Amino acid sequence: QAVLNQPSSVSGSLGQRVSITCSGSSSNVGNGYVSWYQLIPGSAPRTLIYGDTSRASGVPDRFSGSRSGNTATLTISSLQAEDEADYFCASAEDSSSNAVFGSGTTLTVLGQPKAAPSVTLFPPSSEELQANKATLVCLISDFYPGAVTVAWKADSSPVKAGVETTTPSKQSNNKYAASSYLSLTPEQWKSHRSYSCQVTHEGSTVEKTVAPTECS
Amino acid sequence: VQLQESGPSLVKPSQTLSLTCTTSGFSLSDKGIAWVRQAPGKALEWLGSTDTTGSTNYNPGLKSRVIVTKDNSKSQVSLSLSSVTIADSATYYCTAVVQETRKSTDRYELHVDAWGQGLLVTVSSASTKGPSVFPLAPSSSGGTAALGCLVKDYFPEPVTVSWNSGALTSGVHTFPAVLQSSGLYSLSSVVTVPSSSLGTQTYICNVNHKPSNTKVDKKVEPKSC
C-alpha cells in the first residue's frame, strides 16, 4: 500500500498554532482534493477537511487546510487540550475509487498542567482464591503527561515476576489511564503482610497497599 | 447517518474474512460506501468501495483479495477479504465516501464523509476463550467507594462491560486490556459510587464476550470477615 508522507509528531502550546504537512507526488497530493481526518482514541475518525481547503460540517474555522504543490498542510490555531489526536491526510490516486492515506501525525499540546495519577488497588477476590489463583489489580487514571512506571513490592521487597502493565491510553478527559496486574499463587499472597503498587509519574511516586487479612 | 459493521471478531489464517455494513438514514443506492482498515499505530488502508473506477491494482497485498458488494434489499454493503494472514489483523471501518471526477484535466475527488465505529478483527489460529469474571469488592474516602469487576483470561478482543444493565454510567471506568504472555487478555472495569449507597444499592457488572458467546452478570458487594 502506498502511503503519504507525514511527520510522526508535532507539538504546539495552548492557544498557539501548529501546522501538519502531507507530502506526496504529482499523482496524489499534486492532484489536489486532499482530505484530513482526526483520530481520537475510542472515537470514530472525524473528517475535518476535504477538497484541500473545505471544512467538513461541524468543524470550526480554526481548522484550515491549504496546499502548495505536492505538500498539503493542516493548520490548527488556538490549540486546546482536546486537539491532542492523530491526524491523517488522504487523497485519491489515479482514480476516484482508490485512496492513499498518510502515516499520521500525533499532536501534543504543550503548556498543560501536570496531573498526578490516581491509584486504585484491589486484592485477589475470594472467588479467584477459591480457584487457586490470585491477581492484584492496580488501576491508574487521570495522569498527564501520559507516561508512568509501575513497581510492585511484597512487604518492602521488589517483585519482578508475574507483572504485566499496559501502555498508557487516553481517557475522555484529556488525561491518561493504565493498569498493572500482579499474578501470585494464593500461598505467596497470604505469606506476606502486604503488597504495594507504586506508580511513578514525572519523578513523583504514588502508592496503594493491600493486605491478605482484608475481606474480599 | 448510521454505518453499523458486523462480522466475526476472529478468523483463521487462509480463511476468508466476511464483514457486513448495515446503513441507515440515507439512500444506499445513491451513496458510495467503502471499507478502510487500520492496524495499531499504522496508516489507514483503503480496501475498496461500492464504485470502482479506472482499471489497475493499486495494492499488491490486496491484489484480487477484496470484493465489495451492495445488497439494496437489506441496506447492506459487504466486504470479502480472502486468504487472510496475521497481517490482516486490524480495525475495519465502514465509511460513506464522496467519489467524483472533477476535471480540461481530470482530477480525482475522494474523501470520507462519515465513519463507522470500526470492528476489530484478529487473524489467529488460537481458539476463542471466554473470560472468568471476578468481583472487586469495595473496601474501607471522600464519601466515595471504588468497586469493580476483573475480566480475566479471554481471547480475542473485544469485551464489553456495562453496570446495572446500562442504568449506571456515571463514574464508570473500563480500562484497556493487558495482553499476557499466554496470549490471553484481562481487563477491569471500576465504578466509583457514594459510600453511603453501598447499603441500599445493588451493583452488577454485565460482561459480554461475543466471540465465545459468554455473558456473565456478576454482583459486586462489600465483603465481611
Residue numbers in the entry:
A (entry chain L): 1 to 9, 11 to 27, 27A, 27B, 28 to 95, 95A, 95B, 96 to 106, ...
B (entry chain H): 2 to 82, 82A, 82B, 82C, 83 to 101, 138 to 174, 178 to 262
Recite the paper's sentences.
The ElsE Fabs all have CDRH3s with 54 amino acids and 4 cysteines, with a 1–3, 2–4 connectivity, Bess7 has a 61-amino acid CDRH3 with 8 cysteines (1–6, 2–5, 3–7, 4–8 connectivity), while the 55-amino acid CDRH3 knob region for Bess 4 (6 Cys, 1–3, 2–5, 4–6 connectivity) has no ordered electron density in the crystal structure. Ultralong bovine CDRH3 knob regions fold with 3 short β-strands connected by 2 loops (Loop1, Loop2) of varying lengths that can adopt a multitude of different secondary structures, including loops, helices and β-turns. The ElsE series of Fabs all have highly similar knob structures as expected from their high sequence similarity. Flexibility in the stalk is evident in a comparison of the ElsE family of structures that have similar CDRH3 knob sequences and structures, but very different orientations of knob domains with respect to the body of the Fab. The ability of the knobs to twist and rotate with respect to the body of the Fab likely enhances the ability of bovine Fabs to access recessed epitopes. There is no convincing electron density to indicate tyrosine sulfation modifications in any of the antibody CDRH3 regions; however, BLI experiments indicate that Bess7, with 3 tyrosines in CDRH3, contains one or more sulfated tyrosines. Low sulfate occupancy or flexibility in the CDRH3 knob region may explain the lack of electron density for these groups. The ElsE lineage was the most potent and broad overall.
